[PDB]
Amino acid sequence: SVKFMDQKRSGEETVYFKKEDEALLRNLLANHPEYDPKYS
């Protein structure tokens, strides 16, 4: 129950925020071109 809930929580959070980080990595360089080293 303890390791159960902990690992379930960790996996769910990991998946959710992996998706969110993928989306943010997709949409970063457009909205913040001053950081893109492609343009530097």
Binding site: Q7, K8, R9, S10, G11, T14, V15
Partner: protein, 140 residues
Amino acid sequence: RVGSAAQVKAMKQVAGTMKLELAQYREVAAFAQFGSDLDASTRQLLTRGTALTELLKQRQYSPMKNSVQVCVLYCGVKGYLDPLDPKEISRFESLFIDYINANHQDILKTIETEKELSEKTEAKLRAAVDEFVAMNEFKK
């Protein structure tokens, strides 16, 4: 605590990736086992973790040389076991070992002597694995 200082470079190269992949698999598998539907970047994590977990199994009183461990974990880490079925790996290992003990003794001697993986040995091992997968057939 000693860690990599007590470890060969050729085995470092593979074991770092293996530890990372197994950490990710241990993190994700508990949530994955509830039948949810996940993307491919996570399905790859689960597949590689299952492959490595089925690779690290061993029979009793059946140890292996360091070069052979390096070769097997190379096959497991570079993705020559992801599509393959888990239950097949237990023979994919054995056959591969016999193959590299039969026709590729020079790779093992080179790894035993130099204690590293140059690009030449890298390419030779990749070619040997490709030849083995060509010569043989498994359930996937």
